[PDB]
Design a protein around this ligand. Structure first.
Ligand SMILES: Nc1nc2c(ncn2[C@@H]2O[C@@H]3COP(=O)(O)O[C@H]4[C@@H](O)[C@H](n5cnc6c(=O)[nH]c(N)nc65)O[C@@H]4COP(=O)(O)O[C@H]3[C@H]2O)c(=O)[nH]1
Lengths: 241, 97
């Protein structure tokens, strides 16, 4: 009965989520965090980096993907019951573009907790989106119908970036670090960030600059027209909130 | 405190120290300091070959408390790229023999 389900609750350590606050600049204020997967085990903590290679050869990749998005929606649910309306950015591998079970999970979970889709922001690397355009394009279509926002991370340094934007038409962008580390002193970066910034605004694509660590960079992103910013200098990553 | 130093004396110490199942390769560095995941640190490494110190700018991807095993420390993943392939190669071609 209940007892057997209760005995189950005696849950241990395993995957969990830490969060990085994303701050305002040119954009609209809103509680926005980026979720980072982690693994706790008898005292030690691990970044996916230390275990995604073994996952990669056994292909747990997709399951751990679904687990993450589900925990995201969940966390998104609690924060609502607590009356907050928090938004979460979740990294997602292309392996999830074709996976059907992903859509289904997002749908079920999203309803389970009664959380709107606009609260879930799915980010994927630009490089992976055009190597998988079609599957990436239908994933966008499916997910967007539930109201979820999908965007491109590491966007900006390719020969065909601006043409992906007009084609993929994502909700937001996370500027590549190859453009973001430089801005305080690179003319090429200062112009490119503005080029990207001007093609995004007319459509309302949100711009994000991550891994930010200076005041100068902060100031350069602001002027160039970046909507959001993340990084140690802005806020740490942890369970917090 | 940002700048860490790890000197290994023999293929065995390097074998237990060298983490290979990581991405760009990794090395476990003992420290009783509190490093959090993602930390970008600078490690001066020295392998069993010579006393030359190798520069390694990596990220913390593993933290330990030395609880209830293995000394307490952090696992640093080598910098993505050429400079990573360099330290990772030097190490593999050392433990191999
Ligand atoms: N102190 C400091 N630390 C920094 C800085 N920049 C990066 N880091 C740290 O280095 C790690 C690498 O993040 P990543 O490049 O996005 O690379 C990611 C990503 O490739 C992979 N990953 C994790 N979850 C997923 C997922 O759901 N899907 C996919 N495809 N990959 C994932 O695991 C990696 C680890 O992410 P994290 O656990 O968040 O750990 C992060 C972060 O804590 C900095 O300026 N200062």
């Amino acid at each position: 009965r209940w007892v057997e389900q209760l005995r189950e609750a005696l849950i241990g350590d395993g995957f969990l989520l830490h969060y990085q606050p994303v701050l305002n600049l040119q954009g609209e204020p809103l509680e926005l965090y980026q979720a980072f997967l982690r693994l706790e085990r008898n005292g030690e903590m691990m970044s996916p980096n230390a275990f995604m290679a073994i996952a990669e050869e056994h292909d747990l990749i997709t399951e751990i993907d679904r687990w993450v998005v589900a925990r995201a929606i969940r966390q998104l649910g609690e924060r609502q019951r607590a009356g907050h309306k928090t938004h979460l950015l979740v990294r997602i591998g292309p392996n999830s573009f074709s996976d059907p079970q992903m859509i289904d999970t997002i749908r079920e979970q999203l309803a389970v907790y009664g959380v709107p889709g606009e609260r879930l922001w799915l980010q994927t690397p630009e490089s992976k989106v055009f190597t998988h355009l079609r599957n990436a394009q239908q994933f966008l279509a499916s997910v967007s119908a539930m109201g979820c926002k999908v965007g491109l991370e590491q966007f900006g340094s390719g020969l065909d970036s601006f043409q992906l934007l007009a084609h993929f038409q994502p909700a937001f962008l996370k500027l590549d670090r190859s453009i973001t580390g430089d801005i305080a002193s690179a003319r090429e970066s200062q112009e490119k960030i503005r080029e990207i910034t001007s093609r995004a605004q007319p459509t309302g694509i949100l711009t994000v600059a991550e891994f930010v660590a200076d005041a100068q960079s902060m100031s350069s992103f602001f002027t160039a027209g970046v909507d959001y910013v993340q990084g140690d200098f802005v806020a740490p990553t942890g369970p917090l909130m | 405190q940002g700048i860490l130093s790890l000197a290994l004396k023999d293929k065995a110490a390097l074998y237990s120290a060298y983490m290979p199942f990581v991405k760009s390769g990794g090395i476990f560095v003992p420290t009783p300091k509190r490093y959090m995941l993602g930390d970008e640190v600078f490690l001066l490494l020295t392998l069993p070959d010579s006393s030359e110190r190798l520069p390694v700018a990596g990220k913390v991807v593993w933290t330990t408390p030395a609880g209830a095993n293995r000394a307490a420390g952090i696992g640093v993943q080598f910098p993505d790229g050429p400079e990573g392939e360099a330290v990772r190669n030097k190490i593999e071609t050392l433990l191999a023999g």
